[PDB]
Amino acid sequence: PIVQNLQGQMVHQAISPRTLNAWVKVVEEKAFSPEVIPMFSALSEGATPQDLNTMLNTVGGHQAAMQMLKETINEEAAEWDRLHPVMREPRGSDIAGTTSTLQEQIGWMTHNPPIPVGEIYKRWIILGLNKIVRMYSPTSILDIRQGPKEPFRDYVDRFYKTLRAEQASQEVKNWMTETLLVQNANPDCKTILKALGPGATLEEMMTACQGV
Amino acid sequence: PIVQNLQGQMVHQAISPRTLNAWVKVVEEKAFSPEVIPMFSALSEGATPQDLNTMLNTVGGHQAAMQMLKETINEEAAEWDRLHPMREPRGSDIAGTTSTLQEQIGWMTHNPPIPVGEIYKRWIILGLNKIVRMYSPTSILDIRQGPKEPFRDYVDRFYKTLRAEQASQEVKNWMTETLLVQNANPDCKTILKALGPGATLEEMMTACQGV
Amino acid sequence: PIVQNLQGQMVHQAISPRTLNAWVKVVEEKAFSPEVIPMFSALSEGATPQDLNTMLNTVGGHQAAMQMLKETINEEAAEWDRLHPMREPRGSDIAGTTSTLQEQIGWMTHNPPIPVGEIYKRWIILGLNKIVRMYSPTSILDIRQGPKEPFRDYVDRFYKTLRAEQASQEVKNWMTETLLVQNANPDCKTILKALGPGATLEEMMTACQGV
Amino acid sequence: PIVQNLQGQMVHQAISPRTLNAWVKVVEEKAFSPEVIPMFSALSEGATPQDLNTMLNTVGGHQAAMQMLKETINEEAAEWDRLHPREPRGSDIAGTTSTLQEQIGWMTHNPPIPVGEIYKRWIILGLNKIVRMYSPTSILDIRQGPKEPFRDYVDRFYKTLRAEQASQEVKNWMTETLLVQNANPDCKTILKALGPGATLEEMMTACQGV
Amino acid sequence: PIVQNLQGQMVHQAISPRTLNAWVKVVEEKAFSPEVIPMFSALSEGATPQDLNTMLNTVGGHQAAMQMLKETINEEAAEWDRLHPMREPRGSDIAGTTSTLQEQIGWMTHNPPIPVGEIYKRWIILGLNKIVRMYSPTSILDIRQGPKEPFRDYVDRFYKTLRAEQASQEVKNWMTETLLVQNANPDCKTILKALGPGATLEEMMTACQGV
Amino acid sequence: PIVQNLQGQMVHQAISPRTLNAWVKVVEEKAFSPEVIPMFSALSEGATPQDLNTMLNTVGGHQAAMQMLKETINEEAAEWDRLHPREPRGSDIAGTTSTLQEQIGWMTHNPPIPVGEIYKRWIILGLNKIVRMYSPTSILDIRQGPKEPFRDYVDRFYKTLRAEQASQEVKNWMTETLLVQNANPDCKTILKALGPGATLEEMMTACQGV
């Protein structure tokens, strides 16, 4: 993070050991289930690129994913260097915290109009984690279907946990929640859902399918 | 939360990692048992809408409940826009989706403030109440005392179910007066009906010690 | 709790997540063993009625006890409205149910203060007392020394029961004097009669090390 | 503990939940091993009598000891009321008849009237009696087994000697005399090949692996 | 670390006991898996040479590694004395063995600073790199896919080995492009050949979903 | 430790309960492995003699070692009382005959008399002697098993070498000569094929997978 000292100057605050152990436990145990993007954003709230790189590099397992993340970050950094051609201006490799010192990072993050390289880099990281969370999704939302003896609450849990991993826009996710959840239900249960009419809330749908 | 910085400005304090681990543990272990509403309300005591959204979005399980929560928030956000035609916060601003963190801190620190973190925490608690009612594992009419079950343990099950049911107080009065007696063992029920109608819960449990 | 902000303003401080995790663990592990009341009074030392309600409402188990507690708080609040016909707090205001947190701060920081957090913590401790003396597993008259049981272990059981026992200190004095001897083994009871009627517990246990 | 607010007024700081859980775990697990008194003196360092009473009242188990502790606190409080005929009474120092505001008033007076320190002395005087009673056997009964390592016998001897009540001159006599005389006949022979007053380092070196 | 006191003097603050317990657990659980380098560098962001020596010397296990580390540090310190013939630090001063920590505070806060903590943390990381390479459980050429092993798990094992593999990025490029293909199962290798040579890792893993 | 209050006065900060639990765990679990001395030094970097006495006295086990520790502290304190004829006596540096306010006084005079550092040196001298005694065998006895990995033998060799009292010239001779000569005969054939100047990195590179 960044803090201002008693001397009246901006300075680093090292990312806490408990925060790193929390992040590593999150990544290792939850294996890029979609709640990893919000835990990353929450744990990383003040992070400099030094802190962000510390969070990524301290992950031990999932090195396939951490490579796909690194390859995404490099793709975003290359796109940055295209969109932003040539306190110095940061290259993409500077925002990724690779060719920049921590004092350059704090210099940008506290400039008069700040260049928020920690936020910009945290975007590129979340863009990479999104692709990983999609890749670790057990199936596509069009394939999530209710088993012949599966409770509707458990199918709804599977549906909405898969929908979090979809790269659909919210307009398409809206259509999915409205249409696929009924379309993919178990035919007895599906008959109950259609008997509510198509506009039913999820509370009404799950109320109707209690123990069905 | 919001904190006065050393520059004197009102500034965001990030919701603690230990607070998020506590919250996510609470939700995923206790699975919308009714004590989740007061733990939520405690852990979020200072929360901006960004912090509240962080607490909700960091839950991994129970995505049926978390969607029912989001649909409740959208319903309350619409009712807010019906009630309510710096900038005026509208429903998606209270919910922290269309409002920036500095708009949220703006409203929460104006004079008089618009306490968008409190307003949103109300809409969340409304959604969590609906979930806690839906996740009640069996109805109160199904809570019965087993033939060798201590009355104290049956009462624990009965009142734990009454928390989850969200019934109105006259109906809880009727249930605690009549079902708590009538679902007891035949002998324990014989004791409890001998106490007459006015028995306090202390008196009912006192009478059934060691039955 | 209540704290003074850097602007010199009296303001509420959220009851810490570690304090609530500690309290909820204390209640649900120790099951109203008498040390739950000292832990409650420790963990709630500056608590507002909102903080006290947060501590009670976050308990998930023991909903029989938590109902007897609520039932007691309502009885003490009704007695407060009999005793007591800025706005003056009624019993439901002390209990934090009809009062806002800013009212609670106002009462707790007025001059002279109306210490509604301390008053309400009295009513909670009265309810926990009534619960502790019901979760007590047996009467002090039932605590006896087993034929091969060390006197130190019997004394541990006697005084742990005597904490949960309802009795006033004059009666506790008589119990420590008379029952502690009379319920011992005939061997220990012989040694302890040889000490005469007046012996400290240090002397009694000193005499019964090798018996 | 005691802290000064940003208003400059002296105020209470609540004894931390981790400090109470540490203390209660110490008393419950370690069962008045002598190390309990240094842990008490460490955990209670800034404690007002209300903090000290919280530490004692939360212990839960060992209610024989905790009753002996309050009985000897009352012994000390009665002696205080004899030796010192508003000034605190013994019941005020014990935190029973005094409010937290009175306790802080005394502890921050000029000169400070340190009722938390005075009461912590009475508590440690009571825990001494308890540790001396929960001691499993007399120092004179600690003897070395036929194949027991001298290092483990010394561990047992000095752990017993911590709980032993005697003065340091007596403990000097005990460490000189009994540790040798109660040693295994092999070790006892080695310790007679050493000088009569060898250091414990020398004694343990000479008997290492004997 | 170094922190300025409220009296304005620059002074050392020791690494937290929690930071040490974290480091010692990291080393002794993770046993020079490559994530030890970034945990070391994270837990020592502001460390003086005395802080760094405190981290190294508190490791109990792996005294083979800790000796290889020590004699690497001595090689870098000897090279520093070759490159560099208040007082100017020798290599043994930067290693924190011959210098006082007051000299370390001096050098690290001089203008311009002589950043002996950062220099020494480089020598430590160069030694830990050699140890992570040494403790690597097998060669990258020996990582192959089991007959029913998911490609995702094989790629995890491959890139986890490729972190400890010291080879330059030109050779990592060749290995990721051609060994990862050729060390796969015959079915999975057939899928990866059908992509042609230019596939990114995301494409390779996309293709081998459910192979 | 020593801290300055919000009033700017010099103030004791109590040694943290979590730090004491960490130290107590270190001593009970790791039983004077040589890394106990670095852990001790790290957990006590700001300690007054009262904090240091709290760290020692809260140890439960190993009362043989803790007696050796306190009686070598008495030896160092006696040597200080000879070598330095208020000025603190050795018993004051050891925190026995001095108050906490005297200890802070000496630690904050100009120039300071850093009694917490001087005493921490005497404690480390005693932990040195204890670590050298609790070492389960001498380095001459460390040998490689018939099928033991050279990396595990090296781990055992250097973990033993940490606990040796040997000077660095002797440790250089030992690491050069014994580590080779006590290696398994096939593994020793590899190491001999490296020639005399091999680094430990080279020796392990050669014997990895022997």
Numbering used by the authors:
A (entry chain A): 1 to 86, 96 to 221
B (entry chain B), C (entry chain C), E (entry chain F): 1 to 85, 96 to 221
D (entry chain D), F (entry chain E): 1 to 85, 97 to 221
Question: What is written in the article reporting this PDB entry?
Answer:
pmcThe mature HIV-1 capsid is a conical, fullerene shell that encompasses the viral genome. Here, we present structures at 2.6 to 3.5 Å resolution of CA hexamers and pentamers within in vitro assembled conical CA-IP6 polyhedra from multiple lattice contexts differing in local curvature and geometry, alone or in the presence of Nup153-, CPSF6-, or Sec24C-derived peptides.
Additionally, through visual inspection of the hexamer–pentamer distributions revealed by cryoET, we identified 4 classes of hexamer that make contact with a pentamer: hexamers contacting one (type I), two (2 forms, type II.a and II.b), and, in rare cases, three pentamers (type III). Hexamer–hexamer pairs adjacent to pentamers are highly tilted (black, gray, and white points): For example, the two symmetry-related hexamers in the type II.a reconstruction are tilted relative to one another by 45.7°. In contrast, at the most highly tilted hexamer–hexamer contacts, including those in the vicinity of pentamers, R143 is positioned below the helix 8/9 loop and Q176 points upward. At interfaces between a pentamer and two hexamers, one hexamer helix is removed from the bundle and instead forms a new contact with helix 11 of the other hexamer, involving residues A204 and A217. All hexamers, regardless of tilt or twist, share the same structure in the “pentamer–hexamer switch” region.
